[model samples]
Target: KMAFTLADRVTEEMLADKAALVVEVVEENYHDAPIVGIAVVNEHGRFFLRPETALADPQFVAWLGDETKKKSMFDSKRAAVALKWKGIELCGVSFDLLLAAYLLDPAQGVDDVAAAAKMKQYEAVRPDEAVYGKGAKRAVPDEPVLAEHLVRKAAAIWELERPFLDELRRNEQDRLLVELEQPLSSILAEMEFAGVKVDTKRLEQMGKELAEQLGTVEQRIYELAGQEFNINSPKQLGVILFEKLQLPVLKKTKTGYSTSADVLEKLAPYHEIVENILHYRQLGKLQSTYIEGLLKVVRPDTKKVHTIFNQALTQTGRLSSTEPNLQNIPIRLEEGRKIRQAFVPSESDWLIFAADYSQIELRVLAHIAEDDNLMEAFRRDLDIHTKTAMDIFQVSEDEVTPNMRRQAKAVNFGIVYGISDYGLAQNLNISRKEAAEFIERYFESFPGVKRYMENIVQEAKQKGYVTTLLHRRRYLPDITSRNFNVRSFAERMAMNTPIQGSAADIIKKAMIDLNARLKEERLQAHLLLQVHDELILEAPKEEMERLCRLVPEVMEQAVTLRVPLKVDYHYGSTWYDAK
Candidate 1:
């Protein structure tokens, strides 16, 4: 029913009867039910519907019963409800009020009732406490006092949330609500349901094998040093490398010489001992962290590892994972790749399928910034890093070497991370001035990118938020802050977020669409993991070829870019062999 219809039904007699009925319902069902109340009174100061009556009272019960009946009668229930009450003015709608609070500041971590309480200075009622004894004995207030407090709080919350919810409803039109939020929520729920399989036996076996290899590496290190020592201890290793071995210190820490991986890698070219230590450290980390660490997390019953995906963590609107993060798994090293091999298909009938975006972030940047050179390169399907190498070094495309492309690749990714000249210097082993000059030259050659970056920052500063192409906002409170460090960080993020966030949004949308298409097509394939730029799947051997062709097609077409998006598909029986 429309709010006007509901209002039409209200009368002075109805108000008096409602108040008495509310008290009766409270005493009968919710007296010890951890009651939370919210009251909205008429201009005459008569209470309409108190919190006690909101849930269990005869009026609410009748409303709920009508809703159930409507649902049963209509095939499209939500649509029917929306049409009947579309834009109708309502005095108070608790469910809508609560949902509004959820959307405005999703990160605030307050639900409807709690938000209401904070606004109205009403006490929040916890049903779990009264029924389940969660925090019941802490302090007990009298029923009337608690009910009054909750009612006031709820009313206050409704007042505060009203405007924002109205704005949100306008901003997120029914089309967006259906296409993005509803589908996204459903996709996430389905992903949770489709848990990944784990090979506990293989994982444990790999751990044992790695442990044995680690012992061998430890023995070799001891023999090389001519003393038994804790090879894992950086302090002891630093002493041996600098003091005993008389090696030059490339870098210094506050306490002593820095025995970091980069320093060890640099020293490997000069000293045989350093080379051995580097190998040992690399292998040791692979064995313990990747191999053995994964073994402990396999669920005993399901023999599956379920990684939790956080939709709201990244400012750039990226989905992050926790509790055995699948993203951080090493793929660069041979031993690391071997660790991936352990993550094979669950059954013999299945084949591991992997597909990744080809220079996705760069492609997204080109699309967002609309840099002519970048867009042209993407259009021609030209190598982006190679093109960057040619332009930055003032060399012909054919003359650009692998090393140049590698450096350009680093610079391209580093720029998105807000890398400074010092950071670039550390990465490429170049002087800071040279790194700065290279970046400046690159920007000069692509003035559109420079303009876009400047414009993004200015807009973020003005609006106190930046958004992706899809209008997913990242609030930058520090953009308008007085603190230098905070402002600077926000400024860097302002420059980077649209590019990074849009890329993230693109991939996520692709994943959701691809998953849907796979189910619709009745293909025997499963999406296993997403590592930012890549998607992994497990498929039947018969369906492998079709999936390989279709997955990339779906991804490329998921969202059209100013520049064409390309996907690289790799296939192997095991995850390690895919690349």
Candidate 2:
């Protein structure tokens, strides 16, 4: 029943008794696009609700808003946002096709409606790009074309609802979808709507400071080079360093000697100019990318920046953001960390409270590997890196040197990602042989982890995929490949996926649990961001005492594993101060 009509009005009688109202909000442009219309498919017929139709028809809008009315959509978060912008609140979304596809397989790109529909063997619609062109060329098609495309999208959602629900049930992921991801979708929509406040003046000030600093570094570089050349041009810089300055070339590319960050770091000791160039590069990146990039995105009126969290993007079930990625705000350097100072609370009196899972991935590793030494270290609340140093270096607690702890810390963090000797050596600036010995010593101290790694690689070879603790699956096709590089990468993925993915799942579960708890207890604290293991929130000063106790409690109890989940919390007027 592929039928649709452009509707200028919606009536109560037309939506009286519906099983599930499938919806697709059509929009013009792609990024920050305006909603053109809404397409709906139901047992009755397909209809396009123009802005005029929706605004004029209170009864129809009410039905859509009603929590009792079951609704099915491809990406309800997007629809919810579109409806929100149109002075409407979308509710009662029971089935999300995109989210269903994601829960089924995180590795699959389910962002496209066609890709999701293709999962069920239905193929009527072309991709949005095929119809609307792309990038600057993208625009809403002729009314007839746009209406039909959206109608088919709604139909796709209608067709896949039951099949997806059944599949979710069979895979035992229904609860995860229904209970966790679905609720989190609405929460995310709200958070996205309520964006973060950015201090544009602060960013501008930092930009000036970085520019001034960059000038001094630039002048120094030119003085050392004995000539003024474009510091930004890699070719010119490479020639100056390798040829003009007679510095040893570590590597050469097709173009010339590589002046990449690693190469420059090595050359820093060789020439003072190398240090100045590296400093200049950092300052330049801070000025252009961080300072200017942030200024471009901050909303003029609200002085806030809204980031779209791509919940379904990461293969490990982690959430990533775009439109000025709040996560990507550099925190490694003091200059980079100053970017956080610009992220202030929206409410003047409200404080930004941040809570992060302490050594979450390592704790997950301890639980999964069931290594007694590892679990005991966490259980005893000892510094894990220091403990790794104590074990691997065979030193007493007091005797462990800062340098040894640094090496152990690198190894501890690196091991989680199934780091090779070469990778570890590169990271720690040590020889491959030394890195191998350190890894061997660490594994000897924690034999269970080595056994678990071997077992997981073997299991992945046989099963063709690895899963998180919550049954989130990641398929690895090359686990059994003849090519060593491909097979080696697959083996690393197999070893790391469970650890990383489980940590992701734990945090997601915590967000849901914490959201519900906040609502239940009538707390004013609202989650503003989830960056990796950290959950940043904005809360009234009055509720600080309550939130301090409530947040860590919910996050720690989100899941039970062999090793306890630990959280470290801090709050201040701004995100920077909160650190």
Candidate 3:
């Protein structure tokens, strides 16, 4: 499959995920000459039954995404979308809306609004790019052009709302959308307004420390390369790794040698330089993004950071943060996590408390899949990965080695992700055949998971969409696509979306309930941030114990499932200490 081929991979007979058989650009505008256009595709022929519309707002809201995840590369433009618009910067607006034609949006993979509107099969809007040319040659339009663009977007938003609202009700997501998402947006707006305190001086100190560390790592990498080069560059690193050092080349990109982290990781064992190079890259990113980039964003007067939380952006109905994404902060890596040390309590002696769901996704997976072995593991509070290792390897708990548990853990989460052998292999860093066998073993160990995986994908095929626990939906038009790769990806999404989305739903509910409880109890506490599954709060130290009891109670009771949910909490002077 990796074999080089320039010929077309798409065949006419293969099923494709397309907007519809045909989409006609239809417009409805009062005066203003139809700025926003609505396209009604072949709903009856090959699409759906109805088209929805919005009265006109940012009909083309750079909505969040199917995730806050998977697409970290687009964090920047989203800043322009959600933060402040020099377009209407209002002097300042944390809730950004840069109204214009689109560029390639990171998550949607297309900057064009019409394309996004079409992809969702919404007749609500079309691309503004169509109205305003990207051509430098086509000269800028007058005020009419800008007004036309705005009007079109407003009408699309109007139409888009009705169908999706009904769609939400029909699918039982109305409550989730209205009750959970609507209020959550306000809560987030409040949090965004409140913002987080960032110690620029402390951050700069960390930056300096990292710079020193980076220097050492760079020197090691240079020595490993047998001489100095622009240790920061991939081309230089690539030349050293693949050509000079004679390491086998894996994947090549449009530019040149792919000295990507994934590629470097594969070669780390081959050369000590590779390991140092990897560390050097991490240190550099920390210095630049965590330190320098953050300093630029942190308000000079406030000495704080504000991130916009998108309520309508995700495929999974999860929130995404923009404008210097707090979500992108790398907590998994200690060096990366130290960046959080720069985040301090707004008031002196006030404590930062962090709470997160424990094994929430796995718990949701066990509940939805109704896997007895998996459920029993949770019932007994066993380390799930270890339990999986024992069952798959047919060994006693003590007999399971650390490596075995790690592999089992990979298979376990991979099962949740609908990972194919190739994906699992990439994750586990094992041969494809080994990954395949591991999956086979896992299915044997947790037969219900196998059933859930197949049933979910099949259901998506039949229904043309998947629904989360709260009925949040993602339509995968290509589950039955004739193209193997596209179909396979759709299948993976089908298997994973419900699990991921439900987990998101659970946490969202928890936050909603948690915030209410915090208010009712009159605890002098403020919910500060939510990244992934973790929730952070700043509070007076007196109610610390009360919060310890209260937060978990709310989170666990957010929703009732087949199994119990869990929450973990910690507190300290700063986010780093809280973690």
The number of the candidate with the highest TM-score is 2
Q: What is candidate 3's lDDT per residue for 183-301, written digit by digit as tens?
A: 56556755776689998999988888988998788777777778889977767777788888999887767776898788888877887888888888888888887799999878898
lDDT tens digits, residue span 1-579, model 2 = 357767777755456444334334444312344666677777777787776667568788888788888788877888777667667888888888888999888777887778988888889877888878777777778877777787888777878888889988888889878987888899888888788999888998888888889888888888889999999999898879988999998766987889889888888888888878888888889888889988988889888888888878888878888887888888889978888999998986999999999999999999999999999999999999999999999999999999999999999987899978988998888899999999999999999999999999899988888988888888899987899888888988998899989998899899989988999998888988989899999998998889999999999999999988999999999899898
Runs in model 3 lying further than 4 Å from the true structure: 1-164, 250-256
- Please, what is the TM-score per model? 0.73, 0.96, 0.76
Using TM-score as the yardstick, the better of models 1 and 2 is 2
Stretches of candidate 2 exceeding 4 Å from the true structure: 13-33, 252-255
Q: What lDDT would candidate 1 get against the real structure?
A: 0.63
lDDT minimum window of 10 residues, candidate 3: 95-104
In candidate 3 the C-alpha lDDT for residue 90 amounts to 11
Better of 1 and 3 by TM-score: 3
Q: Between 1 and 2, whose lDDT is larger? A: 2
Return the TM-score for candidate 1, rounded to 2 decimals. 0.73
Separately for all candidates shown, the number of backbone clashes (residues 3 or more apart, or on different chains) is 6, 0, 26
Q: lDDT for each of the candidates?
A: 0.63, 0.84, 0.66
Query: For candidate 1, what is the total of clashing residue pairs?
Result: 6
> Which lDDT tens digits does candidate 1 get at residues 330-440?
788776667776677767778888899888878888887889988898899987789888888899998999999999988887767665787789999999999999889
